[PDB]
Symmetry: none
């Protein structure tokens, strides 16, 4: 059973943005870094220039251009997984998926998230990582894994950093 | 199972035009550019000179010189696919398919459409792309994919822009 | 006297101006493009092309005589001939042809044009075809033209409709 | 192998123009002088009325009405050559060629130049001059002389002057 590329090599359909413009966007997706490859392949840049006392920013990297995908199959042994290096290490924010169900009243798209921290400490260095779907996609808050629309990156602490990405995908077995 | 080239290297039969003539044509097809290669072959130029308060332009690039093609088999697993460079980045517009059915009343040809944004951010740069058929060819709004007449490019925002294309095909596999 | 030619074009691009509403006219640096790959009698041609259909309802071409300067033609008038050679893409193709002047004194118009429809002087073939335009005919309807103050030759829209066409050796002659 | 006339006897298409209009133009090319002939034919006059404190002006005399010309063959024993008198001697500016290559990143059109002082001092007098293509079309600055678009004259010293030209061609082999 089949992989899904969130990002490979060329910027993602989505939306990515901030209070007073603290997060570095291009056409409101994340900026794609060329000057800093990895694995032949270029990177995704996650950069928050200065200090948000807005206290917000967000990144939505879609899966099927704002369409729902069913992942339900993937869940119970699945992995968001990818690679990350960082600009000066020990850097943190949130991560996850939103979906979309119109039937549901108390929430249209919901998010399920965690803090990267839980899966990694960050080095000045490349480093694979794999989060079991399992954990997230299971907190009876309603989230319908049949119905995911995208991957998400949100603020944790207000402090500026950077990070880079490669080869963000979902896989199972 | 077999490709369909919508365009390769030389101008399409079709139609393409604007309100006040805002869309660049030649003889009512899109102009093909030569001084602007890509991968050996020249490319199709989608350009809209100035700002439409008209609020309209369109291109239809035909599939079978205005005939019906049956695509039904391809739907299920298919991809309009193609490559695309742009003048100045982050441009956008609508794209899709029109068909033709006569027995049908509340519509003669229908359009099915998405806004390419969904499928790409645009760069000063080549960049392949692939649209799931499947995606479009399915909202019970009547479209008959066994009766597609051609592909379509229409206005989204009133904003001037240019773009290019190469190798526009449909492909599947069975 | 015993009298000399004027070479409007021969074989290299003319200073001037030529342009159109939504860019329907084939320009380069707003003169008309000179074609290389369709020669005629050794020398290169001038290309008049209107790629698609004029919604705008204008297009013009100014080929200058003296880089926008007055030239005095007055003497050529009553015996003269704008003349030159013409192939088209697809035949029976038509538009306006003529001359613009420049007179400062004159208040109801600064520059004026005198004009004909080449139809009158030709039907157009997928083929080369000399033709002679009698100065005479134009440079005379009382409309004020100062043929002693011509600045350039002129091509303007007649019909909405798309074509191409070629030129060579556009000159004035008399005797 | 065959001569390239940049100018002979009749105005050229291009462009030439100045900051606050210091540069004598007409229709935004250089004026042809008629009342100052030189061996039958009239001349091209590069005249700069007043003192430039904008600090720019330029002239481009096209070769193929802003088309690419391929010169490549001519370089390695070629000479831009022409003739030239000046209004009151020892006058100096830059001269050379521009190109156009689209694929190229760090410049679209580039220029190669020199200062004509190097191939002459200027007389109230007619005086042929021959400039070695070689010299120019030759500092790995990227110039691609298979795609020359035109000849160029630009400012060197802010000081007004005039000159005249005659029979500007490329010759070689």
């Amino acid at each position: 059973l089949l992989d899904v590329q969130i990002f490979k090599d060329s910027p993602v359909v989505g939306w990515s943005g901030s209070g007073m413009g603290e997060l570095e966007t291009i056409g409101d997706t994340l900026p794609v870094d060329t000057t800093v490859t990895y694995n032949g392949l270029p990177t995704l840049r996650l950069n928050v220039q200065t200090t948000v006392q807005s206290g917000w920013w967000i990144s939505l990297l879609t899966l099927r251009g704002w369409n729902t995908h069913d992942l339900s199959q993937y869940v119970e042994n699945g992995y968001l997984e990818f690679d990350i290096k960082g600009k000066e290490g020990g850097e943190d924010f949130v991560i996850g998926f939103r979906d979309k169900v119109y039937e549901r009243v108390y929430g249209l798209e919901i998010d399920v998230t965690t803090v990267i921290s839980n899966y990694v400490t960050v080095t000045t260095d490349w480093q694979h990582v794999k989060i079991p779907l399992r954990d997230l996609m299971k907190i009876n808050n309603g989230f319908d894994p049949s119905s995911v629309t995208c991957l998400v990156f949100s603020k944790r602490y207000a402090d500026p950093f950077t990070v880079w990405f490669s080869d963000i995908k979902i896989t199972s077995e």
